[PDB]
Write a protein that binds this ligand. Structure first.
Ligand SMILES: [Cu+2]
Ligand SMILES: [Cu+2]
Ligand code: NA
Ligand code: NA
Lengths: 620, 620
């Protein structure tokens, strides 16, 4: 039955066949995005209609199309020609990555710049970087990538050690033309290598680490059915995968006694942006929407056993479309395992003589992706006690530049002559809430300090206040760590045994949000990133906080356009969008390859249950 | 040799013998505190002088003494009579716990109160609670405990389910007198039981949890020598234990190449307070300094294998003094183990063809203690990449009251008629810094936003600023999560290869600090808790942010008195005191026994190293 099952190779081939049959997938066409659509609200009562949405690019320069296909019925539901100057360019194609370097290698301006620096063109790698929207009027309606150069001394060398600063180029990847080459002047190209497998740099490897072995002799405590339905320690969910978003969780519910209680209908990372804070013209245009522009799912790594995922691992191998509509498996792209998580509850009571200890566990669902120099791990955790958590793990190699003589307010030094521009990694979690069903609301909860006086003569009292967010116009919220600000999603028609609305409380890390000036291009294109929390009324076409087409797309779509509708959110089907990020001032310890740093958020039950939900956990 | 070794049973017996011989430990004397003193600055060049400090109480009502003993030389160094009205009462004695209930059981006012509620005196437990300092002039100079009552239906019942609100009593535990019994009126005593081992409440226990087995077939990668010296993955430290503070880490250093580089000289939790925010006269005096008043070390649990600590565990069994000066072992009171900690670093490089993944690990040093209804786990972690972290795990049973008819702004409902007053758990970490040696300083680092304009035409730039804290008068700092505020401890005379001062950056969680009105008794007695970060000049007698004697002690000592000295801290031997806590509005899920909640902080290297320190970690 399962309407939330992963796409199969056969479904993708059939989408390809349907498109071909319909005249939409001739030899000049390329698939820039393909994904299964979630079933509509209700209609789980009806027979399956598996629908797939496709963005089709044309390499001969004709307008791209957005297409919805019913794979069940073998039909095209809708196909519309896109005006990209207005609505955005399609996501970057994997086949365009190589094009920037290739076009530049025969360009006389680029060659003159390399020759001024005594760099062999055969050794110069060019990063294929998203262009954004700035002052270049000729780029409007064209697919442009910008290129920054890095020297590779030999095939196995880490090019990131040798940035070529002072030089940037812009390229039209469809007409195969170089539009501009800007050379503001030579900077020394940093000379030390960054080869973290070279024994001259590592020194002799440690022989001190004795093995750790994590096994489950009876296997894992979770089950997988219908390909992607998980049942684990009262939790129930479906693990989805989308080429843009990566791992998506559907139908997160908890079995409380006999009743399956919904909590979250859909949880995803719906956008992630990496804005750079170096004002040099060489990099001041740099903002990488890894999700919206590049598609993080498509670059998911195949995860090796004992290296990437440790313990008794169950893998999913999601299927995506290549550029021609053929299915491609990402072997072992999603890890699922349970792990010990320390003490769950402990008490040694003097009066009763009873000593009690129980252990915690969490279910882990993860993938790891690679976008250029960056590598990100996306982890979802379900805990025994009802807690839901997300964590991103950032690693890879830092994006480099020259380190200016005389220093910089916007770049860190990593090695002689080698710099790392300041930047942020900012995520948007889209949480289509379903706390005991879809009739939900959100309150902002602050701690309330109280003045010494009548009613409070000793000046010890403190309290809290909750403010219901009633309509979308008042549901754009900032953090306030000093007052312990959180947000509670509740169901006003579902009460616990103490007659209080059931709820879950979101605990944020209260890290800085987008730092750019509010008048900047990035502040408009990544508007979501300027505030910690947004609440909208659910609509099927409001999927990403940046809109459907982010590449070279101005403001006009996404969250600011959604909330303008000012819809009722007080006891309605609502979606929480939480912004959270890392602000990175690179340190010498990040070089030549960076140790993982993390960021995330969690939600804990708040009167959802009638008492602790883990009283039935056994000892030892 | 080891001058930081744990106290042995023999040393404690010898302290007892020295005190006896000197006329200081006759039959009326009781030891309220005993601990080894750290060796003085320098003088590691000289022969050992193991000194022990003792607080001696007199049950016949004579003044207590503070005593310093050289166990090496068999001498009393100093002995001074204490005026407790001025300097504070000695910590609560374990033998006083039972006294409050015992005295009250034959008091006619208490009996009249129990009879008004139809409660059998034989079933009424009385919590022995610290008294603090309020308006009762007769308590000044006397050792007072206050008592709140909880009914125990039968020997194995959890009394916390049945609070007797409306009733409090005060008791002089030396003269064995009841000074006051206050009955403001009857409240219903909540009737449901809170017995989390009763199958009627748990239901049938889960049979779904398959085993997890964590083993190390070649044993752990750390070594223990001289009883308590740890060497693990370039780290070196000594694990101390003190009856007040619990586990204390000494001499945290990292072996970078051939050179042993100090980082932290002493790390401890030097205080922890639990202030309550219910303005009722029954509880408005309630603030439990678990460290300062009760001594968390002395109530350390014996930790069972496979239950409390999982994996290949090495235990320490610290020795403390009983009330008469006899040694008592806390069997298996400290756990030490290493554990896997996910991915350390990962990169899959397109240009080089090299795919690289390494795993992280941490060394864990922990203990768990029980103070009445609360149980706390204290965990220190050392990571491969140089990160140092502390985490507290709070669990146990919530402290209860009646839930008022018509509700409360300062109490949560847990069950019919059962309330849980709001409260905080606030810790002070004392970090006697030694970043590459003792010449250290502290800077406050904020993110700096930048205006779009000349130099920043695209409005993308952002930066940071560092402010040196030069003297103690300017080193009392608050959090600012919005600006990403951290604090960097550096050594201005020790530079990395890039000519920047080596340092470590403290990352706080930016949770709310003490909420009480600044004019309250708790705001003065727990002044440390009102600000996130303090920096002092090291002095051997500045051990606790609350002073040596916290019990029934007003303001006058501790951190506000230390910083008044306004000493130079810019490139000197300094101590960082970080306040961090949990603000707890109890939820129904906390009842009848609470799932662990956590709080903590970490410090990460910040130009301490010349490049990543984990390039020599091997694969797989
Ligand atoms: Cu970064
Ligand atoms: Cu609490
Ligand atoms: Na919803
Ligand atoms: Na110091």
């Amino acid at each position: 039955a399962s309407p939330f099952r992963l796409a199969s190779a056969g479904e993708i081939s059939e989408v390809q066949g349907i498109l071909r049959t319909a005249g939409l997938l001739g030899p000049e066409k390329r698939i820039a995005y393909l994904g299964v659509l979630d079933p509509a609200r209700g209609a789980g009562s009806e027979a399956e209609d598996r629908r797939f949405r496709v963005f089709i690019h044309d390499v001969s320069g004709a307008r791209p199309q957005e297409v919805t296909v019913s794979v069940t019925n073998g039909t095209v539901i809708s196909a519309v020609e896109l005006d990209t100057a207005a609505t955005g360019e399609l996501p970057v194609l994997e086949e365009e990555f190589e094009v920037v370097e290739q076009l530049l290698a025969t360009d006389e301006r680029w060659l003159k710049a390399l020759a001024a620096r005594n760099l062999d063109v055969s050794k110069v790698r060019v990063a294929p970087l998203s262009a954004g929207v700035f002052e270049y009027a000729e780029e409007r309606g064209r697919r442009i990538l910008r290129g920054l150069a890095f020297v590779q001394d030999f095939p196995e060398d880490s090019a990131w050690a040798h940035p070529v600063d002072g030089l940037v180029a812009y390229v039209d990847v469809v007409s195969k033309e170089v539009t501009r080459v800007i050379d503001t002047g030579v900077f020394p190209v940093p000379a030390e290598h960054g080869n973290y497998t070279d024994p001259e740099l590592t020194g002799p490897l440690r022989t001190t680490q004795k093995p750790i072995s994590i096994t489950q002799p009876e296997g894992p405590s979770f089950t997988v059915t219908g390909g992607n339905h998980i049942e684990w320690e009262k939790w129930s969910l479906d693990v989805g995968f989308d080429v843009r978003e990566g791992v998506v969780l559907h139908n997160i519910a908890f079995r409380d006694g006999d009743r399956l209680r919904p909590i979250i209908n859909r949880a995803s990372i719906a956008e992630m942006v990496v804005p750079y804070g170096d004002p040099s013209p060489i990099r001041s245009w740099q903002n990488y929407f890894d999700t919206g522009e590049y598609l993080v799912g498509q670059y998911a790594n195949s995860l090796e056993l004992g290296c990437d995922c440790l313990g008794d691992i169950t893998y999913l191998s999601p299927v995506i479309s290549d550029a021609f509509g053929n299915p491609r498996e990402i072997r072992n792209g999603i890890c699922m395992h349970e792990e010990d998580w320390g003490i769950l509850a402990k008490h040694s009571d003097l009066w009763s003589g009873i000593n009690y200890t129980r252990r915690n566990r969490r279910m882990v669902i993860s993938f790891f992706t690679t976008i250029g120099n960056y590598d990100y791990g996306f982890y979802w955790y379900l805990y025994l006690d009802g807690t839901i958590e997300f964590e991103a793990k950032a690693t890879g190699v830092v994006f480099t530049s020259a380190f200016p003589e005389g220093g910089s307010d916007n770049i860190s030094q990593l090695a002689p002559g080698l710099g790392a521009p300041f930047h942020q990694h900012i995520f948007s979690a889209r949480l289509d809430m379903a706390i005991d069903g879809f009739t939900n609301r959100v309150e902002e909860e602050d701690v309330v300090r109280q003045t010494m006086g009548p009613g409070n003569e000793r000046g010890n009292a403190f309290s809290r206040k909750r403010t219901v967010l009633t309509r979308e116009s008042e549901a754009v919220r900032e953090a306030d760590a000093r007052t312990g600000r959180t947000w509670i999603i509740s169901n006003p028609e579902s009460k616990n045994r103490l007659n209080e609305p059931v709820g879950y409380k979101l605990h944020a890390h209260n890290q800085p949000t987008l730092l750019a000036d509010p008048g900047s291009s990035i502040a408009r294109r990544a508007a979501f990133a300027t505030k910690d929390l947004w609440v909208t009324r659910y609509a099927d076409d409001e999927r990403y906080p940046t809109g459907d087409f982010v590449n070279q797309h101005s403001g006009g779509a996404g969250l600011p356009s959604y909330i303008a509708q000012d819809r009722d959110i007080d006891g309605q089907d609502i979606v929480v969008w939480h912004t959270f990020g890392l602000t990175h001032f690179p340190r010498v310890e990040d070089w030549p390859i960076m140790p993982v740093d993390t960021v995330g958020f969690k939600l804990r039950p708040e009167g959802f249950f009638d008492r602790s939900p883990v009283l039935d956990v056994p000892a030892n």
